[PDB]
Write a protein that binds this ligand. Structure first.
Ligand SMILES: [Zn+2]
Ligand SMILES: [Zn+2]
Ligand SMILES: [Zn+2]
Lengths: 146, 272, 248, 96, 275, 275, 121
RNA sequence: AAAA
RNA sequence: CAAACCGCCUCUGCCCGCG
RNA sequence: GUGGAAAGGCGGGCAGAGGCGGUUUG
């Protein structure tokens, strides 16, 4: 559906957008094609709104640090998982604007996939959020937003 | 014809990124430790590229000291697309022009090619220096382990001259002051001319120390400094007995223009 | 150097069905005369009304550079300019479909060798790739060497080349407009093709293609109805010819 | 066409029974390119070299009949000697 | 064709920013030592955009002296969409227009792209000056160990023109008097015309001290003022002996207008003797 | 004859990236798994080349220890294209010139061909080492099964000296820090020659510490590093009876320079008592 | 919301030293505190100076913290009652301690207050 | 070796 | 208590030599 | 009493040229 993201796709791709998202209130929801299948529809109706794109890469660098700590970097891979929660809303706690409604389709999917990691595996239980974190960015570039 | 071997002068030390240091790939990083590094390709090809133009300027003033510089005359071979003619920059790589002598007996007397080596058809001269990859020092492994930033993301812009419309981009560069540990091995294949090769390598090091290394450079992204540790000699009998029979030059607090010379290398002269 | 072997499949079943010598003699002479006679007339450049659209890298020359080593009862062994051999394999297939009524088929194993290579090895690569393109399906073509967790059907490749090729390849070794200076887009896609052989089960190769075309893209359960391989796997032998015949 | 039958199938086919061929060969005939460099100019010359490259658990074996003092005095010391100097080929490249 | 090397004229000194400066509301700073710095690209781009203006609007006094300016005319390719016409600013970056000669040997005669360098499709004239990132001086290292304000937070209000409403915000800008230490290396590639490039670069410095550097500047964010330590020359023979065999111009008090002043040919006469 | 086989085991550490190649340039890899490996020929011939150059330096100084180096003059036979005219690198294989002796009884006294082997005509002295093929240590197969990259893809470029035009190529290099596991089996055929053969083999290994191993070595692709585990003598009686008679020297933390002098008077005192 | 103010009061009674909790109770108290802006900038900028560099800086930071209620009078005493309450226990322990540890928890709490302040009002 |  | 934008483009991307 | 013996896929090649974090708000 390359022609979807039409102008009413915000009023079309929010049929069940947050229900199954809140049903994925842990990280390891479903290893299958449901990850990519959810990750397309998440970015499918962000694109009709603004979604200022390049305010994400601090989480990318932080996941790189935690991934170096997967590669025998540090034994404590707990503090950087909490530092994302320290920076979870500071962005919408800094300045607002036109693309805030897409942030309404971004903040509701944070705490389902962010309150999990206190008693989690540090190396494991992490790759599926790590895949949803990139497939949304990827298909959002592919629909034409960046 | 006649490759010999007397020993191997080893140059060790540190490379000080006095300003930021860009070598693109995002700066390169080795896949295992994850830290950035300097390759030896990026460094040999920048000592060479400077000593090239140094020879090209003095191309007529040396041809009684270095023969087979008589067979060149300055410039590129781009305004007449031939391989080997009277011009100095006589090899096409892909679409660009670079001086490599085409034979063994021609390149044995080239000052560039007896030190950085050459190639060719039906003859080949191989190098005398080995320029190894330069990883971060012992201090900066741990400054990385203590949580510091080893790289930065710098943001630049491009301004329209008429309306001041500006257009940003992001570079990613090693932070200033970062220090990499290098090694350069000159393989003493002739005891007649090792002074000239060590002195030409120091000329290339000095010209690199006034220019940049990688990256934009004309905008500040270079500025490498060479902090010397040890010239060593490792003669032909170090490798057989194993005993510490190698001559060391004491230069732990000197400049690349301060080595360049008779006072330092006197025992290497006497050891021949 | 493009070295094509390749013969008519299941022909002994066909000759074991003739019920007189007058019938066997006709069938054997026609199968003989296709390879003895009507294969040089192809390489001259004839019969284009019947052959027509083929995967071709360049406009067909007046005097092509192809050497027929043998062409006999059912088989051949042909060498030549390694990207005029490519058009000739599909062109000989399209003419053998027409010479028969469609009833008989041929396999082709292909090899692209450096010009100064021993001939026992240059023959045992192609003779092995013919058994490889033959024990699979007996209507196949081994287009190019390929990695997998290998051959193609004829009509499968000629349906691919209608689609994937004319959007990236202009003609005579030149890519399309503005996909020039994007040659690295064609090789790195074969990187994204090679995260599929490393694991066909991981679905990471879809968003990476969507990212790289943003800077093939989606999966289908038509492949996963019976676990046949995805469409990102059927692009090696279509991109790889265009890369070998544009500036490598 | 097939060359090697499995032990179970082979005992089938000795009695002229229907048998199955293995669907996998335990090795690969690969030819590695090597090079010869002169010591002065590093100027190269290729030749190719064929060898039998085995899989992870695969290998080769042979059978012995006859008495046991011949095996115990001759063939079993010969196999401990030839483990450190191979069976044919460029055994100074660690081949056999 | 024919790139050569004669020496490297080195211009050191300091940049006494007389008024508070803001490159950047965070000023971009060195991540390792905390302190701000003047980047090298930020100085080179401001010297280039304050010199293409000098060239473009005066195409009478230069085109006899620099050939291959006969392909231009005072203007810009902003209205139309051609990359190569009679308008001066010929390259579009991605949304802005900047003069770059698209050829080697037109840039070899151009007075902008012969000093500041140029791009190209397989032509690519590389530069002749390199501009390095100016950190502080050590007399601001010693002022930073005293815990002193290396910057300041200025509050510049936005007054509504209708409702008479304020809308203040905070800019963060380097303190006045903060004296950064520059480094500009001219790379002598031809002994015929380096008078032109060095007088040309000092013209750019005079038009920079006339103008501002970084930030808005219309509101006060610039006022850049160079203070020279030592022009040098460093011939080719320096990189082979390493001695003190380099020609040093002594202008430890003089000004950027005074160095370009009658007496450029009097101070550089040793460089003229060495070529 | 035969007196046992000395087995040298240990590890190789690719401190910088290791590149060998498989005819955009791949490295050579096991056709079944897909992991890289260091060939035995690529290691053995590099050792032989290094020790050839070392011997060619010393054709005047070893004429009394090793005879039949008196039949050779230091040089090469490429200009005067007659094989074994009297220079050292006397045999031409295809297009290159190697020192390989032409007889048995001349190669029993030449220290290269006594250890590495000669070919001759009607004669054929076979080698006396077996450089066993080197595969990744099981730690680095476990890192290969953790999804970690075991090779990289390094992009290099060539650059025009006047117009700075990039001309890039890629090489596939093994990740620096890798570990391989080597074995070198020396055949004790004559009990006089053993000290000198193992000393020459360790000399050839120690020239390889300061040289490289395959690929673009002077651009920084070698830096191999030998980390010994143990030697074994494996006597003649071991292959007869199959008990544990073999002397195991242990040198677990020793380098090849710490091994030539430290252990050769001491860690081989047990082996000289059994010959 | 009298139960949350008692919850904040009990948590500040449990907020003893600068090593407050290993778990999310740092963030869980930052949510309850976040549930002004320009009056915190004098300490959010003071939070910058504790990273690049010493002894008197803690006393100056405590004076700037007391300066918030030490500048504003009137009806700004009930809403600013907890501002003295949670933070200053996580600073009195930091006198006899190295500056490299035990402060980052106070840093993360002090800025997770502000990080959830603008979103949660 | 599917009549090379 | 910061209002608004711009958040990468331009060019090459394996060759010469052994069979 | 081994289809064997001997044989470094390697020499040379800078991820580079160009680009003000900037325009307006007492
Ligand atoms: Zn040369
Ligand atoms: Zn210009
Ligand atoms: Zn010999």
């Amino acid at each position: 559906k390359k022609m979807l993201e039409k102008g009413k796709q915000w009023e079309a791709i929010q049929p069940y957008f947050d229900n199954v998202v809140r049903e994925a209130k842990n990280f390891l929801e479903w290893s299958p094609n449901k990850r990519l299948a959810n990750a397309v529809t998440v970015a499918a109706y962000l694109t009709s709104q603004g979604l200022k794109t390049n305010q994400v890469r601090k989480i990318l660098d932080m996941a790189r640090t935690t991934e170096l700590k997967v590669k025998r970097g540090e034994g404590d891979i707990k503090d950087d998982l909490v530092k994302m929660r320290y920076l979870l809303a500071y962005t919408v706690g800094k300045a607002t604007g036109q693309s805030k409604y897409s942030l309404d389709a971004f903040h509701r999917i944070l705490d389902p996939m962010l309150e999990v990691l206190m008693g989690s595996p540090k190396k494991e239980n992490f790759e599926k959020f790590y895949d949803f974190l990139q497939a949304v960015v990827a298909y959002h570039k592919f629909f034409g937003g960046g | 014809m006649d490759r010999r071997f007397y020993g191997k002068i080893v140059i060790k030390g540190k490379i000080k990124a006095v300003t930021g240091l860009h070598i693109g790939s995002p700066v390169i990083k080795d896949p295992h430790t994850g830290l950035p590094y300097i390759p030896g390709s990026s460094l040999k090809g920048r000592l060479r590229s400077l000593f090239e133009i140094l020879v090209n300027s003095r191309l007529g003033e040396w041809r009684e000291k270095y023969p087979s510089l008589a067979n060149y005359s300055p410039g590129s071979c781009r305004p007449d697309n031939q391989e080997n003619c009277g011009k100095f920059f006589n090899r096409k790589i892909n679409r660009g022009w670079i001086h490599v002598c085409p034979d063994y007996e021609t390149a044995l007397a080239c000052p560039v090619c007896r030190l950085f080596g050459a190639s060719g058809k039906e003859s080949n001269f191989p190098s005398r220096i080995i320029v190894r990859d330069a990883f971060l020092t012992k201090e900066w492994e741990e400054k990385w382990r203590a949580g510091e930033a080893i790289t930065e993301a710098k943001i630049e812009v491009g301004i329209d001259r008429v309306t001041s419309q500006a257009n940003p981009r992001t570079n990613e560069r090693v932070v200033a002051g970062a220090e990499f540990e290098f090694e350069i091995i000159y393989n003493v294949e002739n005891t007649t001319h090792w002074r000239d090769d060590i002195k030409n390598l120091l000329t290339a090091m000095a010209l690199l120390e006034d220019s940049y290394l990688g990256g934009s450079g004309s905008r500040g992204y270079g500025k490498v400094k060479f902090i010397f540790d040890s010239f060593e000699f490792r003669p032909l009998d170090y490798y057989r007995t194993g005993k510490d029979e190698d001559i060391v030059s004491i230069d732990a607090r000197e400049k690349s223009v301060s080595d360049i010379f008779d006072s330092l290398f006197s025992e290497v002269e006497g050891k021949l | 150097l493009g070295v094509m072997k390749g013969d008519v499949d299941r022909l002994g079943e066909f000759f074991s069905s003739m019920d007189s010598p007058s019938k066997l003699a006709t069938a054997s002479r026609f199968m003989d005369y296709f390879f003895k006679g009507y294969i040089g007339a192809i390489i001259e450049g004839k019969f284009g009304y019947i052959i027509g659209d083929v995967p071709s890298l360049r406009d067909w020359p007046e005097e092509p550079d192809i050497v027929v080593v043998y062409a006999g009862g059912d088989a051949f062994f042909i060498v030549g300019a390694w990207d005029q051999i490519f058009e000739l394999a599909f062109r000989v297939r399209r003419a053998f479909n027409a010479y028969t009524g469609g009833k008989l088929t041929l396999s082709v194993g292909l090899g692209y060798f450096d010009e100064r290579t021993p001939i026992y090895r240059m023959a045992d690569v192609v003779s092995e790739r013919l058994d490889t393109a033959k024990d699979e399906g007996r209507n196949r073509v081994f287009v190019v060497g390929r990695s997998r967790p290998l051959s193609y059907e004829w009509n499968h490749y000629e349906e691919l080349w209608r689609t994937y090729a004319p959007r990236i390849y202009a003609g005579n070794g030149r890519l399309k407009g503005k996909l020039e200076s994007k040659k690295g887009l064609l090789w790195k896609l074969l990187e994204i093709r090679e995260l599929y052989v490393r694991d066909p089960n991981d679905v990471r190769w879809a968003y990476l293609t969507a990212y790289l075309l943003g800077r093939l893209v989606g999966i289908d359960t038509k492949a996963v109805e019976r676990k046949e391989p995805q469409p990102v796997y059927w692009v090696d032998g279509v991109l790889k010819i265009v890369l070998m015949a544009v500036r490598r | 066409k097939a060359k090697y039958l499995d032990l179970k199938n082979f005992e089938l086919a000795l009695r002229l029974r229907p048998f199955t061929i293995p669907e996998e060969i335990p090795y690969a005939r690969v030819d590695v390119p090597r090079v010869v460099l002169d010591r002065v100019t590093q100027d190269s010359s290729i030749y190719f070299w064929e060898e039998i490259r085995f899989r992870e658990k695969s290998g080769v074996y042979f059978l012995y009949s006859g008495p046991r003092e011949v095996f115990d005095g001759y063939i079993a010391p010969a196999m401990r000697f030839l483990g450190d100097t191979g069976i044919g080929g460029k055994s100074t490249w660690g081949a056999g």
